[PDB]
Amino acid sequence: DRKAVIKNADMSEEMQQDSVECATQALEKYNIEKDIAAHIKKEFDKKYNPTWHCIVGRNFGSYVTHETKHFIYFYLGQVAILLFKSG
Amino acid sequence: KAVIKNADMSEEMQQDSVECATQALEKYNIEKDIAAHIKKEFDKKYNPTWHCIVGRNFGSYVTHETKHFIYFYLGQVAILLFKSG
């Protein structure tokens, strides 16, 4: 049951569709959040320039800084994905 | 208490780190506020740009400046702090 809810986002709609698409893949395949995170983060570096950062978690709050138009916070079912670009 | 599970910072800094996340964890009840605290501190102390995650359940994958990384447990809360940009 992987339904996507984008809570907060500063990216282009096209790029946030990929964030979702890539994260869906990642969730299905891998069992460890760190591995889903690593996958998303690597796919984003390659396809979209370094440097990206990813968090995949069930309980976390974050305070981060990011490049304009390179941020997204969303849910895939019950799990929260933080993806953004800095440096 | 402060079970540092991984660190790339100087010993000093890991302290300044642990201590501040203590202040922050004392003063605040919402993770975002704790993270925000720590994060804004470090920006003001060690220059921008720092990022901070505080959660009980999260996997991460991030890229950091040499000597500006730390992931640790404080009680049952995980605290990832690091510089990049």
Partner: peptide
């Protein structure tokens, strides 16, 4: 422009 801080909470 460039850089914006942002906070999240599950």
């Amino acid at each position: 422009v460039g850089m914006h801080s942002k906070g999240t909470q599950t």
